[PDB]
Design a protein around this ligand. Structure first.
Ligand SMILES: *[C@@H]1O[C@H](CO[C@@H]2O[C@@H](C)[C@@H](O)[C@@H](O)[C@@H]2O)[C@@H](O[C@@H]2O[C@H](CO)[C@@H](O[C@@H]3O[C@H](CO)[C@@H](O)[C@H](O)[C@@H]3O)[C@H](O)[C@H]2NC(C)=O)[C@H](O)[C@H]1NC(C)=O
Ligand SMILES: *[C@@H]1O[C@H](CO)[C@@H](O)[C@H](O)[C@H]1NC(C)=O
Lengths: 48, 48
């Protein structure tokens, strides 16, 4: 995880990487906030 | 026909979505995901 070059090296299981383009991992946008949306009802259920 | 569409499927995201528990369970099967990604990449290069 140090840098893309080291990620490429560690994906190929080798300390030397030849000329070319290598698929290493995937970029993904992490979420920022948690949103909960429940109905406006408040009357408790008659479980008792 | 000369070539077909070059497709690539992320094995981890397809099998497990964005769940870390599923990824940890997926690691129990070895390197299946690596083999599948490798084969698809080889097909993609062969099209060019
Ligand atoms: C079974 O019944 C008990 C007792 O309830 C009492 O008698 C019943 C037949 C009804 O007439 C009830 O209206 C009456 O209270 C239930 O216990 C009661 O539960 C309510 C709801 O949580 C309690 O109310 C709360 O009390 C706390 C502390 O006093 C305060 O934050 C508020 O007053 C809040 O509303 C109430 O105190 C409690 N009553 C007794 C006597 O403890 C019980 O819930 C029910 N069983 C089940 C499964 O729900
Ligand atoms: C919740 O209740 C009604 C719908 O039942 C809605 O119009 C109202 O704005 C809501 N109130 C709050 C405080 O969000």
């Amino acid at each position: 995880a140090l840098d893309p070059l080291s990620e490429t090296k560690c994906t190929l299981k080798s300390f030397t990487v030849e000329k070319g383009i290598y698929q290493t991992s995937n970029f993904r946008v992490q979420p920022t906030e948690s949103i909960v949306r429940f109905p406006n009802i408040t009357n408790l259920c008659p479980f008792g | 026909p000369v070539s077909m569409t070059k497709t690539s499927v992320d094995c981890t995201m397809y099998i497990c979505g964005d769940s870390t528990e599923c990824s940890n369970l997926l690691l129990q099967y070895g390197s299946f995901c690596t083999q599948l990604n490798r084969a698809l990449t080889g097909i993609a290069v062969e099209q060019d």
